[PDB]
Structures are given as structure tokens and as C-alpha cells.
Symmetry: C3
């Protein structure tokens, strides 16, 4: 039977700490500098409390339902409170307990992205309800379908670190929220910087081992972020006449988001191109509305879609990628990327709508 490799154990535990750093305090500081001063304390409280909530639901049943073996949509309830997972149980080349924590840290950042933007306008009790509904019915199934051997994985979707699971998923949940409904830029810069650094655990850690794919994801992350910063800044200089700090940080997030599904499958040349496109598409995105912290979902959504589509192109050996699976044309992969994006957008939207309506019918959505 498979034995744990201590180097992979070490790597994956440090990567988990880096992903947790993205939420606490990464995303909290990012939104903290963006939202209105009088709402900062409240938002920091909601992000901290929902984070704690996600950590507990993850261990109680989330992990079991996302990663246990079940059907194409969800796992099982055989790993409740991690029951039946022996301490020395190995998953891949690391102890399963580490896989539990690494995966749980992705659920946290996903929920943090949503809560940080909406804390201002939503009642505390309504946010708790929403998180419970959406994590359970959207994050878990999509995580299972993509990384838990479910529907999307079974059709060969390529999503290295979560362009669908995390990015498009949360962007849609947030946009539905915004539909129903910067004071400190150094703070926004600091949150962006923390997100950037934690994103190396997020992207490289997604290899599940300290190998050449982790190395490739690492370098592609550095390259796409940089290329997206320049793309965004160039567009801003051309449209607005000068760059801005918010543009620079926005560009960084755009490349980070765009390279997320593609990092472990593409060559550096592809990372540079995905980065430039993500930086400009992000700028075009926010520009098309038509502001407030909800434009953040525009960037995550647009760049996530762009990243997911471009993964179906740049993964090709001919463009320096690791190569598509045997017997898979680029045309075929593209079609699977589009289908995965479509399923994600609709699954997340429906569940989000149900979550917001349930909260509204129970405690009232809008803050008192």
C-alpha cells in the first residue's frame, strides 16, 4: 500500500498554511480597504465567523461529501468527523489528514471572497444561513464533480487549482447576491500582497507533491500575475491616461485568477499570454459596469472563465503545455471546458438564489 512521502507532507502542510493566510487576513484586508470605513469592523467579524463556520462544517461532513466516493455529484457520509480515516491513511503521497486540511482551506477562501463583499449589505444571521446552504449544495458538489472523481473529472475537465470550483463558483454566488442586494488603498495593497503570496500554496500545492508540476505551477503563477499587472496597467494608461494603485492590485488578482485553472498544465509562454489577456479582460470587465466592492466578482468571474477556456488551448504540447490526455483533440478539450464553465455558472447561481431566498424567508436578507 501507498506510503506517505515526508517531503510532500512538509510541502502540503506549509501550502495549507499559505492558503489559510489568503483568507486570514488576506481577503479581509483586501475588502477592508475597499468598503466604506463605517462597515469595516462588521465585515471583519463576518469574515472571521463564517471562516470558523466553514472550518467546522468541513470536518463534520464537508470533506466526506466532497471527497468520499459516491456518485457523479456528491460523495458520502462515511467520513463524518473524519471517522474511519486512520491517522496513517495516505492519499496520493501525503497523509490524508493533510489532504483534508488543504482542501478545507480552499472552501474557506471561496466563502471569504463572497462574505467580504456582501457583509456590508447583508444581515449577520442571513449570511450564516447562506454560507451553510451554499457551501453544502454548491461548493461541495462542484468540488466533488471536479476534484472528487465526479461528473466533470470523468469527462476530463482541466482545472488545476479551481477556476470553476473556487473562482467562477464564488463569482456567480456573489453576483446573484449583488443583484438581490476605496477608503484605505495601502490596506487594499497589503491584502492583495498577502493573497499573492498565499496563492503559491494554492497553485503549487495543487500538485499534491513537491515535484516538477508544483515547480511549473509556481513559475506560471509568478509569470501570469506579472503579465496581468502589466496588461491592466497598460490598458488603464491608455484609457485613463495614467496607472493607479487599484489598477495594479486589480491586475494582479486578474492574472492570479486567470492562471488558477491553468497553472499546472501550461508552459511559461502560455502563462504570459493568459496573464496579458486576463489583465485586459478584467479591466474590460469592471469597466462594463456600467463603483462598489461587488465589481470584485466581475474580475473573478470574467478572469475565471477566460482562464478555464484558455487552459483548453495552452495545455496542448504544441504550445508548450503538458499535453492533453491521449485521444483528446484541442477542439474536444475546449468543448469540455465550456461545458464545465456552463454547469458551474448554473449550479452556483441556482443554489445561491435558493440560499438567499431561504435566508430572506427566515430572518430577512437586508441588514436592519
Amino acid at each position: 500500500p501507498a506510503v506517505a512521502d515526508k517531503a510532500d507532507n512538509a510541502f502540503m502542510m506549509i501550502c495549507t498554511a499559505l492558503v489559510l493566510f489568503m483568507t486570514i487576513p488576506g481577503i479581509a484586508l483586501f475588502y477592508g480597504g475597499l468598503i466604506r470605513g463605517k462597515n469595516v469592523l462588521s465585515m471583519l467579524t463576518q469574515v472571521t465567523v463564517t471562516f470558523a463556520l466553514v472550518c467546522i462544517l468541513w470536518v463534520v461532513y464537508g470533506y466526506s461529501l466532497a471527497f468520499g466516493e459516491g456518485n457523479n455529484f456528491f460523495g458520502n457520509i462515511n467520513w463524518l468527523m473524519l471517522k474511519n480515516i486512520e491517522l496513517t491513511a495516505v492519499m496520493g503521497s501525503i497523509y490524508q489528514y493533510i489532504h483534508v486540511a488543504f482542501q478545507g482551506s480552499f472552501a474557506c477562501i471561496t466563502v471569504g471572497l463572497i462574505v467580504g463583499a456582501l457583509a456590508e449589505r447583508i444581515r449577520f444571521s442571513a449570511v450564516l444561513i447562506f454560507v451553510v446552504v451554499w457551501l453544502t449544495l454548491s461548493y461541495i458538489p462542484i468540488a466533488h464533480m471536479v476534484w472528487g472523481g465526479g461528473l466533470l473529472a470523468s469527462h476530463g475537465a482541466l482545472d488545476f487549482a479551481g477556476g470553476t470550483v473556487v473562482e467562477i463558483n464564488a463569482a456567480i454566488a456573489g453576483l446573484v447576491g449583488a443583484y438581490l442586494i476605496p477608503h484605505n488603498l495601502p490596506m487594499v495593497f497589503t491584502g492583495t500582497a498577502i493573497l499573492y503570496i498565499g496563492w503559491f500554496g494554492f497553485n503549487a500545492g495543487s500538485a499534491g507533491t513537491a515535484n516538477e508540476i508544483a515547480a511549473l505551477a509556481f513559475v506560471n503563477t509568478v509569470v501570469a500575475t506579472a503579465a496581468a499587472i502589466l496588461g491592466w496597467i497598460f490598458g488603464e494608461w491608455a484609457l485613463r491616461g495614467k496607472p493607479s494603485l487599484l489598477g495594479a492590485c486589480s491586475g494582479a488578482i486578474a492574472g492570479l485568477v486567470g492562471v488558477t485553472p491553468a497553472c499546472g498544465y501550461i508552459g511559461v509562454g502560455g502563462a504570459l499570454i493568459i496573464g496579458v489577456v486576463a489583465g485586459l479582460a478584467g479591466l474590460w470587465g469592471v469597466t462594463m459596469l456600467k463603483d462598489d466592492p461587488c465589481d470584485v466578482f466581475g474580475v473573478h468571474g470574467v478572469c475565471g472563465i477566460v482562464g478555464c477556456i484558455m487552459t483548453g488551448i495552452f495545455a496542448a504540447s504544441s504550445l508548450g503545455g503538458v499535453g492533453f490526455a491521449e485521444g483528446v483533440t484541442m477542439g474536444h478539450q475546449l468543448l469540455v471546458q465550456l461545458e464545465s464553465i456552463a454547469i458551474t455558472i448554473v449550479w452556483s447561481g441556482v443554489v445561491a438564489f435558493i440560499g438567499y431566498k431561504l435566508a430572506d424567508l427566515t430572518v430577512g436578507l437586508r441588514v436592519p
Copy 2:
């Protein structure tokens, strides 16, 4: 002879950096948002300078006296300036130089906890004197008794990462201080977040290797912190009608502190329970006085005691723990936990009192 494992070397060096991050700037930012604005610069200076002081005393003689082989109370002076420790000397499965640094980082955070709270009211020269006295006569002996094969370890006390050595030890030193004698909440949140993230190096790193115990300590840390945030917040909502940012951060520290002695010995179920209890006991703790940054010692002390006692329960195989030693009943372990706590409280108190009185008799305690 034992050979160093590079994966453990890598893990332990990164964990040391994470523990150093807890002090610089973790604890400094935490207290910085809590104390009065006019005292921030001074406190940041005292924390930085005493930190430097601890780093030097550690290498000069601290490590030798804490970890050298001696008696039940202290080691020896054979490792002065790390003399006689060959560069390739292995301790456990890592180079001894790494053990020196990892252990020294625990001395730093312990002293930071005390200095950050008391900087406001104490004269600079008096704090330096106190640190010298208390690190040498309290931190070192207790570290030796618990982790250096001394008295407490010889009776089978369970303290994975320092509920006695760090937590109860510093809480008592601080409370004696307070006896003799929030302006920026985003800053308090940031310090809490940095402490949380560095605490994974602190807790998981305490395994001395990237194995399944490190994995277990990691997951228990995530779970207890989350459970303590919810416990504290629930109590606050029940007693005060609403949660607060300070309550959320306080809850986090309460679980972090409570899980400290227990993380490598308990199951996730036990971590969740210790977390809830620590969050409520922490709230009860500060509430019972009867405010200022010294309430911080109330949380570290109360939660440290609770953690240490509960370790003697939850370590049982029957409750999902790793199991007590052979021939040791739960009743026996509980008695040893109580004795360790009692010895710590008294040892730290006496030494602290001597330290404060010596400073007072030399330079004058209270700031001019």
C-alpha cells in the same frame, strides 16, 4: 548514528520562521491595536529590543541550560554559544542547529506576550532586567522540566506545544506584573491573523518531523480555533446581544491557546470540544475581571489551564486520542496534568515576583 532527514529539516526551518512571525510582527500588532495610541511606538520598540535580547541569551546559554543534559530542573553549560555542537549533529531527525532555532523561537513568543502588555506601564531598563531574570530562572527551567527530560517529562506530563512552558508560564508572569503595575481593531485583527498562521509552525512543528502527528496537530489547530471562535461569539451574542470583532479575535486566541498542549495527542472530536470549552472559558475569564491589555493574560492563563487538563482526558484512545502511555489510567494522567499546572503557576509567579522586585530595587519599575 542518527542521520538528518531533509524533509524534516525543511519542515522545521519553515516552522521556525512561522513561530518567529508570531512575535515579529504578530504579537506586536495585536497589542498595538489594543493599547493606547500614545504608547504604541514605545511598546513596538520594547518588543523588538527584548526579542533581540532573548535571541542572544538563547544562543549564549539559554539553549544549553534548557536542553543540555543536567538534572530535573536545568541542563548544563556545555553548549555555551553552541560550543561542542557539531554542525552535522542530529537531534531526533533534524540537524541540532534547527532544534536550537525552533526552541529559541518559543522563548521569543513567550517573552513577547509579556512585554507587549506591560510595555505601557514599565520603565524600559526595568523590562530588560525582568526579561533577563525571568527567561533564565523561569522559562529555561520549565522548558527543561517539560521538554528537556526534566521533572515533569519524567512523570509523563503531556504538553505538546507549551500549555505550561509558554501559555500558563507567561500568563502568570504577566498577572504578577499587572498586580504590581482598543484604538485600532483592524490592527488587532491583523496581529491575530498573523498569530493564527504562525501557530501552525508552533503546533505542527512541535512534532519535530513532517509525519502523521504533525498532520494531526495541524488539523486539530484548525478545528479548535474555529470551534473557540464560535463558542466565544455564541456566548457574546447571548450575553451582549451581538458579536464583536474583539470577541471573534479573542475566541481565536482562546482555541489556539487551549489546543496548544493537546494538539498532537487528541482526535478531531476532542479538538472541537476543547475549542468550544476554551472559547467559553476565555469569555468567562475576561468577564470575571471584574478593560486593559492585561485581560490578555486572563485568556492565556485560563485557556492554558483548561487545555492542559483536557489533554489528560482527550488523549485517551477511547475518545479518539493517540492513547496514554502503557500502564497509565486517565485518572493518573489527570493528576500529573494538575501537578504540572500547579508547579508552573508557582515557579513562574515566584520568579516573576523576584524579577520585578529586582528591577524595582535597581532602576525603579514604574515608567518615569
Copy 3:
């Protein structure tokens, strides 16, 4: 052929993230608290954009020219966009892709040191031009001469992590800048703290493996920083009557900088001595002018020179160092250290002057 060791891969990827953390947001926050409030946003934008620029130039041709095999001054253009570097290619004991990223992160911090100080007085377009010229003609050749088997390495210069490549190199580039031409101290402290923590990746990571040299560099880093904090603070107390936060942070950077070339070659005793000397020389340095963020180059330059010279002393086996190369007297090594420093100062100065003059002749240096 050489096979990658996963523990070294894990270590080096985490060390790269820590070095990237030094720039984003380390150096940006450090300068952010030092410069005038009205100039902060602009400086944060220039540091973010030039950082992105350096990341891209590094992958496009920087790495190839710095580390490819060429002559004594520069490498080659065989690794453009990392062409011809197989994904599984090993360099030392890690995948080459990791060496590319680790090395690129050093170029970033070097440029960040310069840009953060000069952003206030320089036109945005002029800074971009300057970075392009100076990275290509100064950073790259000096990196090649020292770490790329070039001129200096061929004569046995000792520079573990960059006293010449990074420190003296950027200090000179900045001083030429200043020649042609604190509002938030908690912010300066936070940036210093982040630089300190990231510096463990910088120094220990320079071993290229998680071995005993990485362990030694780690411990020497803790010791020299602490000793430099105390040295600086003692001098300040003696000259000014009391310590200050800025003095404490300055002392920390002085030891960090001074131990940079020496960390992997000296004993802890030597680290303590280099630390005290660097702290006092740094204080003497800034004092000798005759203020503004350009005094920062005084510290990096003076301490870098002191570190580089003292490396030629403390590396001796007799003083606890790892020992000079076979057949090399201390007198010989000292002469080689002086020659390396001299070449660096002149190479960087000339190139910097050319860079500033080219920018001035193209777009105008001084901000409009």
C-alpha cells in the same frame, strides 16, 4: 544524471515565496511608512509595476543571461523564455524551474529596494527605463560574475546570499539616483518584520538544499539581526539618550544586510560579532549624512561592505567558520573580498549613471 530531491524542491519553493514576500508587500510597506504621506500611493504603484516588469524580463532573458553558460561577465541567450530547459531538468538537487524562480525573486527585491526610495522624485516612465537598463546591464552581469560561474566566482569570492549582487549593487544604484535626484512608523515596523521573516528564505534558501548549511545560515540570521538591533540601540541610547522604533528597525536591517554575504560560511560567534559591527556601522553611516528615505542606501551599502569584508575573516575554521578553500590564506580571501566590492561599486555606479541619463534624455528624470 542528477535527480531532484523532493525535500529540497519543497524547501526551495517555500523559500522563493518568502523572498517574493520581502518585496510584496515587505519593502513597499517599509518605504510606505517612511516617505511623505502624499507620495505613498504612487510609490506603491511603481513598486508593484516594476516588480511585474522584473518578473517578465527575468523569464524572457534575464535568467538565461545571468545563469546560462557564457563568459566571465554574462551567460547566453539559449534559455529565452526558458526554451530548452526540460521541465524535469535538475540544477543542484532541485528542478531547474525552481532555481529560475528563486533567482528571479532576488532580482525583484533588489529592484524594489531602489524603486521604493526613488519613486517620490522620479517620473514613472523614467523609472521603467532605468529598471530595464540597470537590471540588464548591472544586476544580470554581477549575478553572473558571482553566482553564475563568472569572474568573481572564478577567483573564489565568498558571497552566500548577495552582499555584492543585491546589497552593495542596489545601494550604489540608489546613491547615484539620490545624487542626481517618517509619517507611519507602525507601517515601517510591519515592513521590517515582513523583510525579517522573508529573509530566512533569502539566506537559508541560498544553500539550495535543506541541509546543515541552510540550518547554519538560518541560525546566523537570527543571531546577527538580534546583535545588530542591540548594537544600534546601544549606540542610539549613548548618542541620543534613548532608543527609538526607527533605530530598532534600522538595526534589524543592518544585521540582516551584514550577515547576507556571510551567513552560510561563519560560526554563530562570528554572526554575533558581524551583527554588533553592522548595527554600529549602520548607525555611524546614516549619522554621517551629514532625513529622507535615501539614507536607506547608506545602511545597505555600509553594512553590505562590512558584511563582505568580514566574510573574508569569519569564514576561517579558526574562528568557527566553515573554512576557506584549500590553499587560501585569510589574507588572500580578504583581498578577493575587497576586489569584489570594488568591482561591484564601480560596475553598478557606471550602469546606474547610464540608466538615469538615458531616462533623462528620453522622457525627463524628475517627476512633472
